[PDB]
Amino acid sequence: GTFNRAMLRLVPSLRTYAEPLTAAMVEFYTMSQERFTQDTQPHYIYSPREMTRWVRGIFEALRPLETLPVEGLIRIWAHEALRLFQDRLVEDEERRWTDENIDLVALKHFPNIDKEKAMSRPILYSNWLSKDYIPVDQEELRDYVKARLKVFYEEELDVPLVLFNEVLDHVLRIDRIFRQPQGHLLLIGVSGAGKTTLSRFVAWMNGLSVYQIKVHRKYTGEDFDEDLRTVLRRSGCKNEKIAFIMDESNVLDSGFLERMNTLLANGEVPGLFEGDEYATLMTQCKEGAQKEGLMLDSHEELYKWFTSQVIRNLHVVFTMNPATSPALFNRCVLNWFGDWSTEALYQVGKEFTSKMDLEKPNYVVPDYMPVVYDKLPQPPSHREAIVNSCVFVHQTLHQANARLAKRGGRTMAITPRHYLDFINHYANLFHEKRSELEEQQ
Amino acid sequence: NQMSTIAGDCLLSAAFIAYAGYFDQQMRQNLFTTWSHHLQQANIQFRTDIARTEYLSNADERLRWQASSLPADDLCTENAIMLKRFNRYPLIIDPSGQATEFIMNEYKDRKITRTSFLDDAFRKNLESALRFGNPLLVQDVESYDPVLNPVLNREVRRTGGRVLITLGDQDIDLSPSFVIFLSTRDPTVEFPPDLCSRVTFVNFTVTRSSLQSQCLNEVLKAERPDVDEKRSDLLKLQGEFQLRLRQLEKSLLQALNEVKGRILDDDTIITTLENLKREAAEVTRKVEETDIVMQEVETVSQQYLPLSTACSSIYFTMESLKQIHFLYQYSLQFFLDIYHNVLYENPNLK
């Protein structure tokens, strides 16, 4: 309540809503903490840090805006609630429960409010298409991110990417993290989902400089300390935005993680810069403060400014698969990469099989067609049937692995990388056989 | 018609390559039958009898494989096809080592280097393979070193004019001619889903069904040579006969190019045409009688099926005998020697 009063001090129109909003926040937080516990999923940890992140998100969304209606404040409240609570959830019923209760808590504490105006099914926020972090519709976001993916094909990696709904949602989540104060992300999910790809794509898209640790045979803690020195020197002194991406190839060493937690929490690593290193850090911090326009002279104030710059400049992106301390879970904003849904598989198939012919004008739609994509157009075309069959093949591998596990045999995981491999193989084989027959003809 | 059929054929073949490979022979066949049933249910045209080995390979490559140490089995031919048309670096799970020797023989001209994960000099060799562009076969993958994750995932960063890959603490210049074959000799091994995503599995393990099929094929080859020849003709009719027919067509066109006076010097050139026609008729006959020969070979195979099941059961009892006592170590080659003794040099059969 004190924090919300300080936050809503900017917009006087929402001051009388400081007391109710806080209550709503608290209630929802409590509800989630009762509903989701670490016994189900190890990352279902809730603490006052999530509430501080909620307040910080609402503060960052409200700071540049001159005025808001009450519906806008409730909408950003719901947006931050979704980004902090629903994102970590693994199963679908949990996400549905969270989405329903957000509305209940909002209305319960905010009566006489236009629910439609304050609550649309695709609650969406981004300042990519404007100057301020305003709500934005789904279609223009999809168009803008498709254009930026087309750009990202030339610069950096050349392998194609498909922008389906889950990918775009995760892109928006990672962008929100990259625009938060000390916003650190933990992409937890299945292998091959696209965690590294999307993290790097959003980091490039927002201009962040991707830095990754290169551990080796007997990696020394002194080497990790030097890497941290370089990263914080660039983030704080040089005013450079850095996406500090870490993967399980080096996250598995918890000795570095427990030292990373200090930077994740406070935004500084005391004892990292000492002696000569501390003197050079103070010199460069003085130079940077003068360049920005601050004549801070005392070493303590310079260190405070450096810590603030690291808070506002350095973002750490952890990438892991479903050991890790709950403190690390609670320091980072949790995002879940599930296995690609049927719609995602269908979209990937249609995009990656678009250069193929896959068009029979005399194709006959079979009565009671076996359909795996519910939203598949009826009546389907030949290409639609082919992509449906591809999705069915992936689903049959999943069912086969489930049956083998039930019988007691050893099974391997079918990641979305298997589906991408299958579609690439289909393209190569189709083109090869067509070329062979055409030259024969 | 083959234009009409290629879409379904390639869908099934690509699914087989990408998805099958860890499963046993019956499980691959069940997956293929499920996919074929779905494609038929949706009116997606495909050939009813997809011979995967002959669709995804030609006689020249199969003969070259047989020149190498690739056993002439359906499972091994399918596994070699996966080892050929792979987009992800394969993980070989042979318990015997024939597949590793096959890989070494295939890439001997490319200077393939055999390394192990247990070797302390592994990483260094890997760096060389990444930098100088040489095939590398890394064994003992059950102790997989996660440092290979960027290499298997092909995560490259194109800084400057040099393409890099992060191996350990060092950024190695990836070479276009690099290929790595992971391998293991442990059939009962579990891999993390990360590695499962970065590699394609190629299982050479001999199971009950694989050995049953081997024994059935050997019975057919030994005691019913005519039925074995007819079955081989079915497999060859999936393109090999047409391949040689079109090769003779090309030869006839080449001979018909040189036509100036010598076309009617004897006016008996028609012989070559007759030859093609004859073979055409032959293959046409083999096309027309395909269903009858399929029924015949299936009945003859059902005749010797119980013997094949008996052979599989006998071998697996022999293999399991090691639990009774440590001396009871009997290899598959030992059972095959027993079985060839029973088949060929059996004085009772005289």
Binding site: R407, G408 | R208, S313, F316, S320
Partner: peptide
């Protein structure tokens, strides 16, 4: 098991259920 792999699960389930039935649940100190 290793001699013939395919029945074993149901038999083991029944055997373990019977064993749980015979073996007393708790022993008092």
């Amino acid at each position: 098991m290793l001699e013939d792999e395919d029945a074993w699960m149901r038999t083991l389930h029944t055997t373990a259920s019977n064993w749980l039935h015979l073996i007393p649940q708790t022993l008092s100190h």
